[PDB]
Each structure stands twice: as C-alpha cells, then as structure tokens.
Amino acid sequence: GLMQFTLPVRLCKEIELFHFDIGPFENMWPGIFVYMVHRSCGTSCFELEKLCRFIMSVKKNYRRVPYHNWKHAVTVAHCMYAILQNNHTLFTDLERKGLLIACLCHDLDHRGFSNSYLQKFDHPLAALYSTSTMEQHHFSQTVSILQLEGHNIFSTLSSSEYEQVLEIIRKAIIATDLALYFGNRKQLEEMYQTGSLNLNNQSHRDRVIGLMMTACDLCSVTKLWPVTKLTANDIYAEFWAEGDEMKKLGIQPIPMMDRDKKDEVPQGQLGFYNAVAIPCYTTLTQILPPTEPLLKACRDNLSQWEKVIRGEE
Numbered sequence: 001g002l003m004q005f006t007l008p009v010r011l012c013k014e015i016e017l018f019h020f021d022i023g024p025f026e027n028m029w030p031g032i033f034v035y036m037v038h039r040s041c042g043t044s045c046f047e048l049e050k051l052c053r054f055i056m057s058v059k060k061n062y063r064r065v066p067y068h069n070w071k072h073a074v075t076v077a078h079c080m081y082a083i084l085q086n087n088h089t090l091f092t093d094l095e096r097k098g099l100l101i102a103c104l105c106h107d108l109d110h111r112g113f114s115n116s117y118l119q120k121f122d123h124p125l126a127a128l129y130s131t132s133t134m135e136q137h138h139f140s141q142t143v144s145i146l147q148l149e150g151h152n153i154f155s156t157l158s159s160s161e162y163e164q165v166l167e168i169i170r171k172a173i174i175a176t177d178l179a180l181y182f183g184n185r186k187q188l189e190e191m192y193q194t195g196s197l198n199l200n201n202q203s204h205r206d207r208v209i210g211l212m213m214t215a216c217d218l219c220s221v222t223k224l225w226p227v228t229k230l231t232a233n234d235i236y237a238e239f240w241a242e243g244d245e246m247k248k249l250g251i252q253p254i255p256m257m258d259r260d261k262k263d264e265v266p267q268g269q270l271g272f273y274n275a276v277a278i279p280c281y282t283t284l285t286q287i288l289p290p291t292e293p294l295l296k297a298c299r300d301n302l303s304q305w306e307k308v309i310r311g312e313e
C-alpha cells in the first residue's frame with residue numbers, strides 16, 4: 001500500500017518526456033512499467049503482487065526477436081504513459097488502467113513476421129484469424145495470461161467494468177494493425193476538419209484511442225536521432241529475415257524486405273515518414289495538442305534521413 005517505486009534522478013525526470021529511451025538494463029523495465037502505472041493510474045488500481053506476476057508472465061511470452069520484443073512492449077507503454085500524463089483530464093479510470101496493459105501486451109508472442117508472410121506461408125493462425133491475424137493472436141495471448149492463477153489484475157472490477165476494460169484492450173490491440181490505421185486517420189481527419197469530432201461519442205473515443213495506439217506503436221521514429229537510427233537497424237533485421245523467408249517460398253519480397261537492397265533504405269524511410277509517421281502525429285496533435293513533441297521529434301528524424309540521402313551522413 002505505502003510501497004512507492006522510485007527511479008534514480010535522471011530517469012525520474014526524463015521518463016516524463018516523450019523521447020525517453022528505457023535503456024539497456026532489462027531488469028529495470030518491470031520497475032519502470034510499475035512506476036508508470038502508479039503515477040498514471042494510481043497505487044491502488046492494481047494489487048502489486050498480481051501486477052508483478054502479470055508483468056513477468058507477459059515478459060516470458062515475448063520472443064528474442066530483434067525488434068518485436070519485450071523492450072518494444074515497454075517502449076510502447078512509456079509513449080502511452082507520456083500521452084496520458086500530458087492529457088490528465090481527458091481519460092476515464094478504466095481507460096488509463098486498460099491502455100497501459102494494452103500497450104505492454106500488444107505484440108505478445110510476435111515471431112518477427114508480418115500478417116502477409118503468415119498468409120503466404122499458410123500458417124494455422126491465418127486460418128483461425130483471416131484479418132489482423134497477429135493482432136487477434138496478441139489479444140488471445142493477453143486473455144490467456146489474465147486467466148492464469150493469481151494473474152487477474154482486474155479481479156476487483158465489477159462484471160460489467162471487467163467486460164468494458166477487456167473491450168478497450170481488444171480494440172486498442174486490433175488498432176496496432178497498420179492496415180487499419182490509414183482508414184482510421186482519414187476518418188479522424190474529416191471529423192476534426194468538419195468539426196463533428198465528439199469525445200462523448202464512444203465510436204469517436206475508439207477511433208482516437210486507435211490513433212494513440214498507432215502513435216505509441218511507431219514511437220521509435222519520435223526518439224533522438226541516435227536512438228531512432230539504431231532502432232531502424234533492429235526493424236530492418238526483421239524485414240530482411242522475412243524477405244529471406246519469402247524467397248524460400250519462391251516469392252521475390254518487396255524491396256523494404258530484400259537485404260540485397262540496403263542502399264534503398266534511406267529513400268524507404270522518407271516514404272514511411274511522409275506516408276505513415278508524419279500524418280499520424282499531425283492528426284494526433286490536432287486532436288491532442290499536448291502530444292506536439294512527438295510530431296516535432298518525428299519531423300527532426302525525417303530531416304536527418306534527408307541528410308543521409310544528401311551524403312551529409
């Protein structure tokens with residue numbers, strides 16, 4: 001009850017900022033997550049014993065892949081923490097509870113392969129879940145861990161509150177399917193510009209939480225250049241492995257996934273920032289003005305990639 005988590009001074013201060021990097025000490029990441037739940041949600045919203053047991057089972061169910069790993073889960077949870085702390089009064093008690101858990105759980109048991117690769121491989125998951133294949137799996141793994149003995153962190157919620165928080169988590173996790181992002185942002189763009197956006201309309205809240213999930217999921221493009229540049233290596237290590245696996249199925253992969261086409265990466269990053277990242281954080285900043293630092297940092301990294309292309313690095 002009276003056991004507060006405290007970080008060292010530099011972490012205590014920098015964890016409040018959007019561009020925070022959780023660092024290379026894996027054993028500190030659980031403590032960083034609990035610190036964020038305690039400050040974002042309250043020291044009372046979860047039983048520490050159950051939360052700790054839930055976190056360690058979630059960690060165990062992330063795989064040792066270069067990018068879609070435990071460090072990604074905690075990085076995505078921190079971006080959501082920063083959005084929630086900078087938007088204190090906008091979110092319900094169940095939303096703050098659900099969204100940090102959704103972020104920690106959003107890539108559970110990821111193998112380093114796209115929905116596309118699972119479909120062309122004819123993986124059993126592609127037969128069980130025809131769209132948002134990996135994301136339905138991620139939600140399924142979240143529910144499985146919630147049902148382990150002593151792992152029900154929501155046990156004190158009513159039956160109807162419990163159903164609400166699991167529906168927040170399901171929608172939040174499904175929304176990390178980037179295929180769903182493009183249409184969601186377009187609709188939010190139109191709703192904002194025609195002035196019909198209404199945060200009391202549950203269907204509107206869902207869309208806005210969806211965009212927050214994309215923003216948090218992509219937040220490696222909102223870090224200081226040295227972090228962004230080194231994280232880019234980890235994402236391409238996954239892409240090039242999937243490309244190898246495409247070649248093994250007798251399919252020439254898209255250039256993004258072909259390791260014979262590393263030279264095209266800088267131009268590929270421009271397209272990604274212009275088509276995906278900048279529009280995401282732009283629309284997010286229009287809806288939630290205090291998330292402007294994510295857009296600013298994103299624009300900084302686009303400019304760094306333009307400098308790479310012009311041979312200035």
Ligand SMILES: O=C(Nc1ccnn1-c1ccccc1)c1nc(C2CC2)ccc1Nc1cncnc1
Nearest residue numbers: 178218220221228231232235256268269271272276
């Ligand atoms: O770079 C990414 N994608 C990409 C490169 C070239 N074209 N595209 C592209 C275009 C349209 C749709 C999907 C992909 C990327 N993707 C993802 C998600 C989509 C899996 C997450 C992070 C990403 N980048 C990155 C991460 N951390 C540090 N720096 C950069």
Ligand SMILES: [Mg+2]
Nearest residue numbers: 106107134176
């Ligand atoms: Mg994912």
Ligand SMILES: [Zn+2]
Nearest residue numbers: 106107176217
């Ligand atoms: Zn993710």
